[PDB]
Amino acid sequence: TVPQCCYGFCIDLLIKLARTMNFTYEVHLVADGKFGTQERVNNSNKKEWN
Amino acid sequence: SIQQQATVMLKIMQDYDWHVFSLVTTIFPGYREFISFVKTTVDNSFVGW
Ligand SMILES: *[C@@H]1O[C@H](CO)[C@@H](O)[C@H](O)[C@H]1NC(C)=O
Ligand SMILES: *[C@@H]1O[C@H](CO)[C@@H](O)[C@H](O)[C@H]1NC(C)=O
């Protein structure tokens, strides 16, 4: 979990939102590296996202 | 127990293409767990019918 340098349109929008609403940004990348939806895994009994 | 019998009944409902059902229960105290389990399984939508 080394710190990277990610930037672009989304971070600019986030900075605008933080300035307009006193937010503090703690941007962290998703471990799975995917959007994440519903799927079936081992022991298919509980509904969960990724 | 009630939990596993409920799963068997839900598998039976999976078979024969039965998707709409209604719960009719008495004031029997040992069925609130049954109602809760059925509600939780209804909330479970990632698999099943
Ligand atoms: C959120 O909206 C309410 C209603 O307009 C406002 O009073 C409040 O200040 C807003 N939050 C921030 C952090 O400005
Ligand atoms: C943000 O916080 C500072 C100090 O906590 C405060 O003076 C300022 O009014 C806040 N901004 C908003 C929009 O409430």
- Chain B contact for A46, CB < 8 A? yes
Q: Which residues contact B48 (CB under 8 A, 6 or more apart)?
A: B10, B14, B41
3-state helix, strand, coil in chain A (%, to 5): 25, 5, 70
**Residue A40 gets which letter from DSSP?**
-
**Beta carbons of A44 and B14 less than 8 angstroms apart:** no
Residues in chain A: 50
Task: Dump strand ranges (E) for A1-50.
Answer: none
Q: Quote the CA–CA distance of B3 and A28 in Å, as a whole number.
A: 40
Rounded-to-integer distance, Cα B37 and Cα B33, Å: 6
Report how far residue B39's alpha carbon sits from residue A13's, in angstroms, rounded to the nearest whole number.
40
Experimental method for this entry? cryo-EM
Q: Say what the resolution is, in angstroms.
A: 3.8
Ligand 1 atom closest to Cα of residue A22 = 13
Q: Determine whether the interchain pair B45/A45 forms a contact, defined as Cβ–Cβ distance below 8 Å.
A: no
